[PDB]
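Submission sheet (multi-component)
Chains listed below:
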Amino acid sequence: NTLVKQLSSNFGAISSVLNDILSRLDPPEAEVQIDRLITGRLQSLQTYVTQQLIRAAEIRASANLAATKMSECVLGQSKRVDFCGKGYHLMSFPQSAPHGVVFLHVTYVPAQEKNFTTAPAICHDGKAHFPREGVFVSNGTHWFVTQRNFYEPQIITTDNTFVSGNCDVVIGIVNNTVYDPLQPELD
Amino acid sequence: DVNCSNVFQTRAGCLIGAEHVNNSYECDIPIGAGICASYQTSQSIIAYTMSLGAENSVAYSNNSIAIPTNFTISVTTEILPVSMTKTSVDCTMYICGDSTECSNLLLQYGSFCT
Amino acid sequence: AIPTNFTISVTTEILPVSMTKTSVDCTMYICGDSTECSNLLLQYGSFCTQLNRALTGIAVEQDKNTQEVFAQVKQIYKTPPIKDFGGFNFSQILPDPSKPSKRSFIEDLLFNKVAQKFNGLTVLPPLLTDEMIAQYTSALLAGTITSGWTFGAGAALQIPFAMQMAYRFNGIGVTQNVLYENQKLIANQFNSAIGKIQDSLSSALGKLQDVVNQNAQALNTLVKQLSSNFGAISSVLNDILSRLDPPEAEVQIDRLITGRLQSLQTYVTQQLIRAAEIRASANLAATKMSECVLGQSKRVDFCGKGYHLMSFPQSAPHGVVFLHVTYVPAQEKNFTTAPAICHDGKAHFPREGVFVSNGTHWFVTQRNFYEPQIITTDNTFVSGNCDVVIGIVNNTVYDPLQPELD
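Outcome: structure written.
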């Protein structure tokens, strides 16, 4: 609609019609009137194309950004933090849209939580025990073992705890016995 | 940029028609200098300071860790453009019409329209 | 070569998220305390109408970039009252209450380094002040030393820093038991790395200064154009009308209006190009906020230089300062390795480590640290015979299942 208004503007002349200049004015003296009309429109065309090149860069930047999310969030699982939506992304569902695309991410965000006591290490017979990938928790006096996501207490055995020296090197290490399933198997 | 009932003089401007209160609410209409305006409580246009969020703190401990017990499933929606419309502009039709001398002067600027 | 020692190094990175705002109007620039100037400006009103909609379209994007980098959560977290963070002393990144502003000592050190409106060069004031930006940076540093990565994806989960530091160190392949055996060594190297950055920033922020210089340089260009004649004899509109009548001065006023429209189209073109660089840099800075600060990103040459463990975002005028914690090994030796070890006709392949030797005995350790461990059957597994492997040595396995039966 902006280019339509340029055809009606006189640009300092007496009329914006090309046929009107060659009717009321002689051709030998009409060269100074048509030149101002053409020059006034060339500045509008150069500005129009300049704006289209800038808007094309924003669309190109959005197309390259959406292409990475199409080959990672949809095709495969992206382990990045806050990339495929907002939370632990699992799978995506791309949907079509006029002059665009709509993404449907399925995140995994926990809900409520509780509070339990922990310990950096557990000392048994002078050997420091460390978890493999879990975290030592405790409800009452009992010391259990769970993962770092869902609350699933288990029994602290020898398969989840490994020795790594003595107990006089860990600052703030507690003292608690460790159940050994190998002993009842030999009895 | 005017030096200054319900007159409020801030670092961004001068608003006449909104009473400033000591309470802080959520932002809505941005004005400047971290001051927003909204239609809240009779109810009229009042001025206040925008709220940056609910101030809270986490009790730091040395022998306690929070373990989540319940998990939920949330689905989000994002909008990203892909393409737009395509147009075309020609010098022989937009600049000149059904004339003859108009196309003669355009030949001198043929490199621009090309 | 298996590394035996580890060091802690902190790198810096200056990236700009925003700039200065400036609004230009055709009224206080092209026209004057004159009367005929406005009449001619109505024929070229379509050019100035786009200026009032293109310059304002940049100011709405500068405030939007600030809501994507510094605005990540909806809760304002504060620092805990206990200053004991597991042996690590935090005071350089925490806001000092004795200071008049809510900024730390590092944020206050970089702040010291970082007539025109009468001609139609109005400056729009920013929305977010310098006090509200420091509040968002304090909430990110509070959740990092406490939670770390659980506050940005749900509720805040409290966890001591002694056990949280071991989780950040296991993201490279090293076990967690090594951190507890050298807890005093990491605390001495972490505090020494902060002193090197503090002394370096007290005696160069060129990424945030060149942007301001380019803004003021383009403003002086429009000032020089108003004093020119553009083919006439004067520049003030109140001087030409006082000596020439409007019926005869129309050949000079049109040249001044046209000669100023070229500078407006050139100035608005450079602002749109510089806005694309700030918008592109804002998307890259917002990505590192959710990758380096939020979570442990294993990307190479992305969160500093080397193995990344944690980050600490800071504040900066028209920018953002990051403090990554890199990991680089040092002091390595030479040991003899072997692809596999044959026992009673079975090739034992490792699971996560590699066999090492010192010329006499044969040990086994991981891929990132030298830990002298005996050859066990629980750390390896059999797979076929020994005549299908090109390179394999022969050594007796201790077999931990033998002493258990005695």
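Remark: Chain A is about 35% helix and 20% strand.
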